[PDB]
């Protein structure tokens, strides 16, 4: 456990995640005092939602730490899929929170009661400052690719929520109208879902063993080039998938002539797919009868 | 649409499924409505639990239909992963809800409200008997020895027991903190129930060696090394594509004059007797 912290601060992304999580926990302690000072009704719920925020940050940090683990007998490809899975789980969770902004939104829309004890628009401003630091640190967010994407999208969803609550507060105070708050909430939910969609599409495609999108357009030319090799009869059982970001695994079976140069055909096929961007390739050569 | 008129009559197991999802979702709606009408949150949490129990079956049916789709260029392995993903997704959407419920639940730990509807006792007992019916005379809804019984019966009857106990504790003794802790307990039960499905799904999606294949692989490697002309094995990767369908890849180094046809046939025999459906053996000839 003593050496666990040294790995966290070594890598840039893990250290950034850890520092942002520590800042979130410091804000949690500040609110914990501020709320055990007899303002529980809204403050404590805000704290528990932003503790959930810290939970998402912890999930991203854990995925970053685990992805660097050494491969073993049970985990032959390593633990790199935790990079993808985090990006999945962070994305879906955001969709979940979008519904929380939707349903609660109509709780303030058709229902006249506007009971509210926001702490004199003070915790919201500090939370938005925290969100600005978060979006500044993880600007490269929008194997540590889908982790950073999901973390950045979560921080941006937080920023949109802060914009919504601050805008509603300035609406009811100065303009005095009440209809803006449900509209801002539903618009924030729509923006959250729209931003989340691409990351979810990439994560689902990777987990569904789909052909890599940046490899799909070059695969037929690779197939023709392998087919052009002297003594290759046919190609079959071609399979290409994404392990983690930029890491592609491919497998194929070649039928060749009964007396073909299998050494040379193997070297040429591996060259053809190394130029295409495949890192891990398996070529099974079957000699034909005639 | 009109084709379902005759499907509902000729079914037996699909009849059991149809009746199960007909009463479970309807009573989930009833419990949600009564929970919102009251201020009890244990009822709402139980309704969410059974709603996701039914959505698990609906997603399983949809995922089976998608899994039967023909493969193509983008999806060369097919859509067979859509089962595991679907289950995974439902599990996540359960845990989040429990994760939310707990939160709101402990909210009412600080400031407990008290609203009664003079039917809370009626609807909790009816929810319990609905769960008993669906778990005993229907055999569906199994949420997953002692662990088996915990996953099968307890994980979906303890929520009803808890809401019944909250109904007793709210009206008879009169204390105000019954449902905030009942909601927390229901959330804990939800997470505990969902853990094993998440474990299996995550193992498959992490490209892990199949657990039913792991203990036979060393004997397979020893048998492949025992083939004449084989020098060494390399870069073996075995993973679960879908349930009981395993993909394996390995590289062999062999003698510069070795019988590659025979070694290939023997390696495929070895790993087929281990239960590997798809196998890719790359063979490299050594210099010396």
């Amino acid at each position, epitope marked *: 456990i003593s050496g666990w912290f040294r790995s966290i601060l070594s890598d840039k992304t893990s250290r950034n995640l850890f520092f942002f999580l520590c800042l979130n926990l410091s804000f949690a302690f500040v609110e914990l005092l501020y709320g055990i000072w007899s303002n529980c009704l809204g403050l404590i719920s805000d704290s528990f939602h932003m503790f959930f925020d810290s939970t998402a940050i912890l999930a991203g940090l854990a995925a970053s730490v685990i992805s660097k683990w050494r491969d073993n007998d049970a985990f032959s490809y390593g633990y790199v899929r935790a990079e993808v899975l985090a990006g999945f789980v962070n994305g879906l969770f955001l969709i979940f929170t979008a519904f929380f902004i939707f349903s609660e939104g109509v709780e303030r829309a058709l229902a006249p009661p506007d009971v509210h004890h926001e702490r004199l628009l003070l915790v919201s401003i500090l939370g938005f400052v925290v969100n600005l630091i978060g979006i500044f640190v993880f600007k490269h967010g929008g194997p540590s690719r889908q982790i950073l994407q999901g973390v950045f999208l979560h921080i941006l969803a937080d920023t949109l929520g802060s914009i919504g609550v601050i805008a509603s507060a300035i609406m009811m105070q100065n303009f005095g109208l009440m209809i803006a708050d449900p509209i801002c909430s539903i618009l924030i939910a729509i923006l959250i879902v729209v931003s989340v969609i691409p990351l979810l599409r990439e994560s689902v495609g990777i987990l569904m063993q789909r052909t890599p999108p940046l490899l799909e357009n070059s695969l037929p030319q690779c197939y023709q080039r392998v087919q*052009q090799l*002297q*003594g290759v*009869y046919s190609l079959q059982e071609q399979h290409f998938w994404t392990l983690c970001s930029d890491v592609y695994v491919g497998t194929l079976k070649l039928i060749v*002539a*009964p*007396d*073909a*140069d*299998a*050494r*040379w055909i*193997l*070297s*040429q096929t*591996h*060259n053809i797919f190394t130029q295409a961007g495949v890192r891990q390739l398996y070529v099974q050569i079957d000699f*034909a009868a*005639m | 649409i009109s084709g379902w008129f005759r499907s509902i009559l000729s079914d037996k197991t699909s009849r059991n499924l149809f009746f199960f999802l007909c009463l479970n979702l309807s009573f989930a709606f009833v419990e949600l409505l009564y929970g919102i009408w009251s201020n009890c949150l244990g009822l709402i949490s139980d309704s969410f639990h059974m709603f996701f129990d039914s959505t698990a079956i609906l997603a399983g049916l949809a995922a089976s239909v998608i899994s039967k789709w023909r493969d193509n260029d983008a999806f060369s392995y097919g859509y067979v992963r859509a089962e595991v993903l679907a289950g995974f997704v439902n599990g996540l959407f359960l845990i989040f809800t429990a994760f939310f419920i707990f939160s709101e639940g402990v909210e009412r730990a600080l400031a407990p409200p008290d609203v009664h509807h003079e039917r809370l006792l009626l609807v909790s007992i009816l929810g319990f008997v609905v769960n008993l019916i669906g778990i005993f005379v229907f055999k569906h809804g199994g949420h997953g020895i002692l662990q088996g019984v915990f996953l099968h019966i307890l994980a979906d009857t303890l929520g009803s027991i808890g809401v019944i106990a909250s109904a007793i504790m709210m009206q008879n003794f009169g204390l105000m903190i019954a449902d905030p802790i009942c909601s927390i307990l229901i959330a804990i039960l939800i997470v505990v129930s969902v853990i094993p499905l998440l474990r299996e799904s995550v193992g498959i999606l992490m490209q892990r060696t199949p657990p039913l294949l792991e203990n036979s692989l060393p004997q397979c490697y020893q048998r492949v090394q025992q083939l004449q002309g084989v020098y060494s094995l390399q870069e073996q990767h075995f993973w679960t594509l879908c349930s009981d369908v395993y993909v394996g890849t390995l590289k062999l180094i062999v003698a510069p004059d070795a019988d590659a046809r025979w070694i290939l046939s023997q390696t495929h025999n070895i790993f087929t007797q281990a239960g590997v459906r798809q196998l890719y053996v790359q063979i*490299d000839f050594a*210099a010396m």
Partner: antibody, heavy 118, light 112 residues
Framework: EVQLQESGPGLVAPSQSLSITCTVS????????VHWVRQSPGKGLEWLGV???????DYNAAFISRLSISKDNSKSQVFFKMNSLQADDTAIYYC????????????WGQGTSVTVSS | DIVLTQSPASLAVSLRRRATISCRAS??????????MHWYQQKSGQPPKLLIY???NLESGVPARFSGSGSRTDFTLTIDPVEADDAATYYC?????????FGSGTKLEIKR
């Protein structure tokens, strides 16, 4: 006992076609590829093409538009057919049995000298 | 295509000595531990005879005095000891790339 013999016209008129028949013995065309290679004092040895045991043919890109290699397994002969014969094509032509599993030519015929002149 | 250059174009050696023939390729003719380069010997009025395949492997039935070496772009055929029967032209041929190409040839002069 493996051997290859080519029968072809020694003299070919320019702009006409050249046809050589290579008969092999000691091995089958069902599991062996056969290469066609020509040698001239001008440019040395030049690889023309190969035919495989299933009927697949691979040519040189310089002769793709005017070369055709065919074969018959039962009667065990390979037919070399070139079109548009010019003066630079005067050379000794060889049918060669490919070395198995290698990119070498392990056996050669005695080779026939083809002269393109009027 | 790949161009093979043989140096020297002619080399004169005496009996019971070592003859070295060097072939050089414009680009690497290697893949994954194998150099797909083959040495042939053509006597006068004879078809070429395969001596070395894959740049280091002695053909079945050729005398042990022939040896091959090299990798990537530079390859060497060595005859040691040189006999009187070795008076021929030695060629290098690559098979790494389509089309197959041969070397320029190198004549062996047996000094007596």
């Amino acid at each position: 006992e493996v051997q290859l013999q080519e029968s072809g016209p020694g003299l070919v008129a320019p702009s006409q076609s050249l046809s050589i028949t290579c008969t092999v013995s000691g091995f089958s065309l069902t599991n062996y590829a056969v290469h066609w290679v020509r040698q001239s004092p001008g440019k040395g040895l030049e690889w023309l093409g190969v035919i495989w045991s299933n009927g697949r043919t691979d040519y040189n890109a310089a002769f793709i538009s005017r070369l055709s290699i065919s074969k018959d397994n039962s009667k065990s002969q390979v037919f070399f057919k070139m079109n548009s014969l010019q003066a630079d094509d005067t050379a000794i032509y060889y049918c060669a049995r490919k070395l198995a599993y290698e990119g070498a030519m392990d056996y050669w015929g005695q080779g026939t000298s083809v002269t393109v002149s009027s | 295509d790949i161009v093979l250059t043989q140096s020297p174009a002619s080399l004169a050696v005496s009996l019971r000595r070592r003859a070295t023939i060097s072939c050089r390729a414009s680009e690497s003719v290697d893949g994954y531990g194998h150099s797909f380069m083959h040495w042939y010997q053509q006597k006068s009025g004879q078809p070429p005879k395969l001596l070395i395949y894959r740049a280091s492997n002695l053909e079945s039935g050729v005398p042990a005095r022939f040896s091959g070496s090299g990798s990537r772009t530079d390859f060497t055929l060595t005859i040691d000891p040189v006999e009187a029967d070795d008076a021929a032209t030695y060629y290098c041929q690559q098979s790494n790339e389509d089309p197959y190409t041969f070397g320029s040839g190198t004549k062996l002069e047996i000094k007596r």
